[PDB]
Design a protein around this ligand. Structure first.
Ligand code: ELQ
Ligand code: CL
Ligand code: MG
Ligand code: MG
Ligand code: MG
Ligand code: MG
Lengths: 194, 194
């Protein structure tokens, strides 16, 4: 029933554009929507976000997260390792690379989602969510070497998967940080699972 | 270390703006960022709510109630948690219960409400509260739930068993062009990993 008729550039930057989208509502009535897109896609998706499951024997399984200053938020956020996928990179390869860059950990692909939307009322940004395990007992992960590209400043925060939501709520309480919605949703479902 | 120096408007629409953000990096170097923000945020603790709605029904498996809508930014149909912006002076809990009723017909009961979490913090300042709500599907109020879609809202309801949520999402994705939301996919993934 519904579809795009046309778009109108409102404003284009180096990284992001605002369009005014004209679409046909299912009654036959034409309507407008202000939409954001990145200027960077070719690709399966804009980005990958990595769920990294750090597995060490005789230890709790942890989920590895990153803390970074996010200029649009004006503050520090707690997030899954993530970045944009390069021209000709697969989502998997991007995932392993971003994970190593942001955390120093070297991991193995467990599974890879289809492209999923980030905020579909506002943008067209999509990602692949990529579940990766990290054999934390392997010598290559003993003193993990985080290799940031230019301007990245990433703190690594590993939390136990069995108490993830309580641990995240504590950090928010004591630290004035914003947790990412996908991180919080995953933590919620860990508690909700039956 | 890091903080905002200035926020210069690039373009302001009726509902979304684009800003040039100048900030201080942790090396003491000034950098900039293109940031998206909504124009609708007042004193609300967040832009919006998303509802994790747990439909409970004696001798049924618990379902997660989802919605499918056309999303003009995406140019297609998306499957999401029920969600909407918080009205000025409305509480997040109130906004969740109202939005859930408008989009699905169901009258829920509040279970928990997250702090403000960031939607896509490399891109925008947008935040939500994620509100978990139980729906007593044995209550006669919830028997034949009628959506009250607002002007230009056209929402289909999709209830899926919690115990098979990821496989059922994968099946819906397999059989038609539609994108699953990242927060939904994240929650379904954690249901599997638990
Ligand atoms: C009230 N009508 C006007 C048209 N419409 C929008 O243009 C819109 C509102 C907020 C957004 F963030 C956005 F991206 C788009 C909403 C429905
Ligand atoms: Cl796993
Ligand atoms: Mg990143
Ligand atoms: Mg990176
Ligand atoms: Mg909505
Ligand atoms: Mg609504």
């Amino acid at each position: 029933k519904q579809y795009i008729i046309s778009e109108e550039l409102i404003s284009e930057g180096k990284w992001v554009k605002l369009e005014k989208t004209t679409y046909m509502d299912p009654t036959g009535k034409t309507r407008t929507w202000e939409s954001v897109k990145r200027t960077t896609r070719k690709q399966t998706a804009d980005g990958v976000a990595v769920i990294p499951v750090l597995q060490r024997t005789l230890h709790y399984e942890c989920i590895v997260l990153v803390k970074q200053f996010r200029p649009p938020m004006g503050g520090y956020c707690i997030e899954f390792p993530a970045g944009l996928i390069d021209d000709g990179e697969t989502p998997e390869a991007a995932a392993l690379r971003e994970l190593e860059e942001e955390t120093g950990y070297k991991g193995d692909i467990a599974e890879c989602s289809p492209a999923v939307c980030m905020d579909p009322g506002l943008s067209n940004c999509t990602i692949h969510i990529v579940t990766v395990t990290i054999n934390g007992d392997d010598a290559e992960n003993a003193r993990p070497k985080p290799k940031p590209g230019d301007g990245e400043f990433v703190e690594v925060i590993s939390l136990p998967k069995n108490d993830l939501l309580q641990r995240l709520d504590a950090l928010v309480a004591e630290e004035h940080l914003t947790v990412d919605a996908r991180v919080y949703s995953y933590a919620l479902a860990l508690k909700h699972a039956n």
